[PDB]
Amino acid sequence: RKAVIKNADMSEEMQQDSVECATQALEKYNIEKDIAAHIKKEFDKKYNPTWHCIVGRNFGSYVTHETKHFIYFYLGQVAILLFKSG
Amino acid sequence: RKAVIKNADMSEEMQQDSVECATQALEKYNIEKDIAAHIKKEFDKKYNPTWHCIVGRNFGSYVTHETKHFIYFYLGQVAILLFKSG
């Protein structure tokens, strides 16, 4: 679950929360949808809604985010896309 | 390939267009990122922004959508998630 951030439009403190939240989610949950849900909910609480989270090993995306609210990173071999829109 | 709709919160006309648009995108592109980009851009133009599209073979997601603007379906072994939010 080593974290490597590939791209971000996010403050350093929010980047840390992204990794820490995903790290806990991956420790606690085995199922991809449940990992994603954990991460999303933690951001809605602290940074207000509406956040969206994608967690997986094989996907591409094209999305729109609110400025300064985007991160894309890996934990090991699993990619996490976390952003606000709406 | 064969289109199979699993969930939808979307009108019948938009559902068919989502599949048709993804089908054409899948015919034209091999890269999931580029397939997603085609699908997103077409929806912003025809049905107003802001749409988001994720295309892939392995992922879980937890997202929030505007009512009547979400579909999740397969084309063969590739899943496409498309919705509006923001």
Place this chain on the structure above:
Amino acid sequence: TGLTDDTHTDPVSQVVWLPEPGHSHRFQVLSVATDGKVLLWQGIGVGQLQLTKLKKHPRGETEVGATAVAFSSFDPRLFILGTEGGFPLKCSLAPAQFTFSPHGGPIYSVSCSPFHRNLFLSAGTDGHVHLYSMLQAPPLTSLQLSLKYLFAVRWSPVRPLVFAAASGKGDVQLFDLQKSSQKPTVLIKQTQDESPVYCLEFNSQQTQLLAAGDAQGTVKVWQLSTEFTEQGPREAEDLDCLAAEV
């Protein structure tokens, strides 16, 4: 666009793709020279081609032209040339090893062997589909269709060892090796007065899509169910290998 100079003036009979030894995305394009050149190039390389030369007893009555070439999936450097002379020629390009004497009529169609690399097809004016194994070039078997010509053959390495072909009468024959040799199992017909089919091809993405072309500008698709898979058909390979060795 290609060139118009001596590089490739001949009215080439066929174009085929091959994987390039480099990144798998790259596919070299070849043509079958009617004059005795083995021509390969890359995409931008269509101008100023990169490879060129099979001639047995050069500078004389030696004009090695062919009508089709097939390549074995086994190895990029194994293929057969459908020479106009009629005797299939094995070439690895120029080197050559076997002349396959069982088929003597000018060749109009060839096909590489499906898996197991032993059922190599040649067919021409003879009207007879001679299979052979490049390992020794024996006459394996000859389909004895009493028909004017043959114009296409259908193989699918994906499926068990089965055979079909389009003949210059309008019929398309199917053969289940484990049932019959000379007697078509399933046969596809034309309408009462349609002139013969002149081409046959099957979708590489199997999806049971076969296509043939009539004497009109119309291509017809059939959905075929006969060729189901099964455990046991391999026996056909052993039967052919034993026939060859005796």
Place this chain on the structure above:
Amino acid sequence: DIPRLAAFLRRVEAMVIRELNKNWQSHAFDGFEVNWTEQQQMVSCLYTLGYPPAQAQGLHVTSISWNSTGSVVACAYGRLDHGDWSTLKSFVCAWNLDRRDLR
């Protein structure tokens, strides 16, 4: 750790060498007949008839192919038998067997 790996191999060996042979020739129930698909009927015909309308009136098909990627994409090319050395003779007609390709 070679002797640790060997120890594991011994334990499983004891299980497999016995279990496998007993099962292999168990000659158990052999009536399994599952298809996972409805039985297809006799081979069908005229599934689709693709062609350029006007041009197909005089031309005949000489070269066809399928796109390995877009399995829906069927290609055809007709031409005239004679005069193929001088003029433009024909076109390449493709049609998809894809969504909404009702014509």
Place this chain on the structure above:
Amino acid sequence: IDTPRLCSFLRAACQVMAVLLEEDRLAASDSSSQLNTSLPFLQNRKVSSLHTSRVQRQMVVSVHDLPEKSFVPLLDSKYVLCVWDIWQPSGPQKVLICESQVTCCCLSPLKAFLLFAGTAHGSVVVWDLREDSRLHYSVTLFWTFRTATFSTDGILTSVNHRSPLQAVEPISTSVHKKQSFVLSPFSTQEEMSGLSFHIASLDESGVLNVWVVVELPKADIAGSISDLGLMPGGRVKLVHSALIQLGWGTTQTLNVKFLPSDPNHFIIGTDMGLISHGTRQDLRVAPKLFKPQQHGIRPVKVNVIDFSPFGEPIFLAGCSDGSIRLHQLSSAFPLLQWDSSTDSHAVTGLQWSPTRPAVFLVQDDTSNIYIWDLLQSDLGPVAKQQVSPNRLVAMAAVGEPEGSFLALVLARASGSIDIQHLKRRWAAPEVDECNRLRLLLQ
């Protein structure tokens, strides 16, 4: 779920489970007896014979013949074959039924696919063993019977020869199907599909017959003549002659025994006191006869023939005078002309112990079994034991060379069944191999 079209799956799932449960059931130097004598359908029948197996080394078959007294008022065929196992609990596992007297019974050596028997009136029958229980009359208290065969009683032919049979044996010589010839009208493989062994049947006339047919793709009813089941027929036939040297002038046979090593060789014994040798493929290899160091005739009326289940190909036979000979295949004369104890009576049954030492068993008319162990003693019986419940009908020695076991199953004229295990003699094994070689060398 409402449709039978899906209930077929439920049936198949049950069939798998039933077989797996049946497989799961196949679990495990003086008198130590066991009994398996449940009488669910044997209440009045009398034992007539025993036969062991080779695929399941813990299986035994027992023939029973019903008297005129009907324990059940149902139409009850008088001839049944009781199939049960040594290690299973009390209660037969299966039963087969026929119309006329059954004898000359044997099993399939590769797997339990077929069961064979020769009829008293010369016909041949075979039951389908590998068949689920359905379309057979069942009874409460459940127990279900099984009857399914197409006998040679149907389509008339010559293979019957209208002569009572004497013995049958599975002939494991199928080595054909080298290839289906490229030109199908001349492919011989097709007709051999599913054929893994033949069955031989010798009659009193001295005419040997061999054939077998196997076929699975079938339906409830067929256009051709058959039973209303899914079973093969008897279209194949081969016939071999015998008694050329032996033959009023008309002679007959009594017993036949084939060679386990090369089943193409066999010997045949006659009432005139001689045993001939022959084979199937090359009929001039060694057309000699076996004879002891005697003169004249001595029509001892040989009645039991067996084979030593070990490397050296030695046949054994016994006669009504209580004598036994070891007719080594490579010799016209026997190795050891032993006259058994109590020679005043006849040989009633012979067998070789399914054990590492070459222990040999004989049963006589007085129900006194004598045992030899030639690896450790001379020609004198190494052991013997008679029984108070005398009038033995049959025995069979059953064991397996590793888990291992050794047993002996018997039956009495009273209709009872017995079995015990004295596996201490299963093998040394080291001493047995030492003496085995010694006996062969000397």
Place this chain on the structure above:
Amino acid sequence: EVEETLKRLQSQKGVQGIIVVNTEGIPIKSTMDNPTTTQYASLMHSFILKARSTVRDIDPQNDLTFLRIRSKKNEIMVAPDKDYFLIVIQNPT
């Protein structure tokens, strides 16, 4: 017919329960308690699907023919299906 065979099977001392799961985890027939019936149907539905994928991944022209999973407590067998399969649990001991 099938009901009688199932009863006969259940009577066997080895068998610990039988479940007939029809519509992708929705049973109709069971010889077990409700919590176990529902859980077992779900688990074996997911489990058999994984095995079928594994076989196709090994070779793209072969499917599952049978699947057995064993444990200390009990042993479970399932068979491939078009519409639905059947679940049997037995004690191997």
Place this chain on the structure above:
Amino acid sequence: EVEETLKRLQSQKGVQGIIVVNTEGIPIKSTMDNPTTTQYASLMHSFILKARSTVRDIDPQNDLTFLRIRSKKNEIMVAPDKDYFLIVIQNPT
């Protein structure tokens, strides 16, 4: 010692190959070709994880004891262990 027993197993008429999977789906020993070596090791690693979880889910006090997968093409058997399992493939024909 163990090398001889593995060869002994390989010599059995049923056995078509043996793979010793050690490092979480990455084998260290094989008697098979390279594509198959990695193919079976990887796929069966994923599967056994599912099978072991399945047992824990159906009953929270039991682990896997054994698994068998059958197919038209071939049959594969695996047993669980403390550190790693072993794959054996047979031809049922």
Place this chain on the structure above:
Amino acid sequence: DSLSLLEVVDLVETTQDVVDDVWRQTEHDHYPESRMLHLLDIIGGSFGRFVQKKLGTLNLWEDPYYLVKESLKAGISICEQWVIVCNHLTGQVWQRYVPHPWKNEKYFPETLDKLGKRLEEVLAIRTIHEKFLYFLPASEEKIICLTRVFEPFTGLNPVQYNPYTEPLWKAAVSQYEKIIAPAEQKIAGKLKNYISEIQDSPQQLLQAFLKYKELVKRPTISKELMLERETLLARLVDSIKDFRLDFENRCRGIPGDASGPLSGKNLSEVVNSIVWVRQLELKVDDTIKIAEALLSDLPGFRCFHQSAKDLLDQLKLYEQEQFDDWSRDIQSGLSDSRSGLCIEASSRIMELDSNDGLLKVHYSDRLVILLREVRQLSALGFVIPAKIQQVANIAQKFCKQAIILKQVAHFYNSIDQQMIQSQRPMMLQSALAFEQIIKNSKAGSGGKSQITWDNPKELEGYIQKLQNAAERLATENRKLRKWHTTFCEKVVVLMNIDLLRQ
């Protein structure tokens, strides 16, 4: 001895030729008879000893008969071929090249002839056995037993055989024929069932006999299959009857069906007739040989052969007649009106008052015709008279320029009548600039007419200049056509749009 059997099969031909040549009247009328015969006798006998040794090393009793059959057949070919060429060529060599006293007489004892027959008997025996082996389930007992019965029989004719006790072998063969017969009888029964099962399909019938012909020709089986062989004969008669009628009704080659369309039709109808008749000849010839091998010359065959052979001969004549006409017309055409300084004359524009410059060049069509003509004759194994080879080599030189000359000529003539379809100066004005480039070269048209004949490189330069202009104009044409379609499509839609609704 250093050469294998598969190679000496060809040496026999080379050696006979070279030895007979050197004996010719070179330095002396004739070399003394001593060596004249002695050397050939050594060479012939040496082949004998050679084959005798090499066949022994095949182990003509062991299991790998596949390779034995190949090498054995070579041994026979060596033996027979040498004898045949000796007996034939000697008759003429001693009359034409060396005035040797012997004329129209042979010399060679023909000991190879007996050796060749010896191997033929072995091959026939082994072949028959292999045929029985295919039917091993039918005659298992006979095949296995007889193998070892016949082994001591074969031992009467060992490897390296010399027929000095030949009667012993004759006895062995007599017993062979009398003892193998049970095998033939059982197989004869099987063959009757297997062939008669064929529902009178001439195709299956022929293959049935063809595949087991070695057995059918056996006296036992031949008689058993007498009815089947006569049935086939009648059908074979029907076959050539149909071929005869099909030939007669098509030989004129008038309708397309009678000729048979081919991709080589672009040369002439000659290619169609050749292929058409080729098929007829092979089919009729094959039927004749099959009937001969199977029927054993019964009245059935007598009638069949008469008709079928006459047809075959007519077919052969048909082909040769068509060829002779082809060859004559090509030689005449070259000698008449093509050898007369054919040149690459410039476009004759003024003759055709339509700008359709007529590039009148004899080579216009002839280049590709000649190339196809020589390809046809070469592939088919015909001699190409020098006259054609000479003009063909000349044609190659012209081809190097005609390929590009036609392009620039066509573009000029085409653009002139395609740009006018749109009337956009974009294309009409620049096309004139292209025409000017053409005219600039045309200023030397009188001399251009003679370049290719002597040195085509100068013309290549002129053409490349015009082609560069053609490429620029072709690009503009493509853009023009693209736009023309684009505007057309949108206008035809707009007129169908109701302003009140859409």
Place this chain on the structure above:
Amino acid sequence: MIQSQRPMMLQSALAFEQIIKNSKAGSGGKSQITWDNPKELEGYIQKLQNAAERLATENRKLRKWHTTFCEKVVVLMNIDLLRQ
């Protein structure tokens, strides 16, 4: 046959029995065929057997029909009265 008691096969069986019964009456002269020349008896039993064989064939054909009718009924009990 006796498991369905079809009057057709029952009547054919009666005709078969008539062969036996009429043949028995002939025993006045035929009861010594075997003694003198069994060949007549070989024809006798083959002809009688042939009649039985034909009976067996007809029975299976009627069973085929029987199944056909059964196949229909199981379909019929799956018809929706309110729609079909």
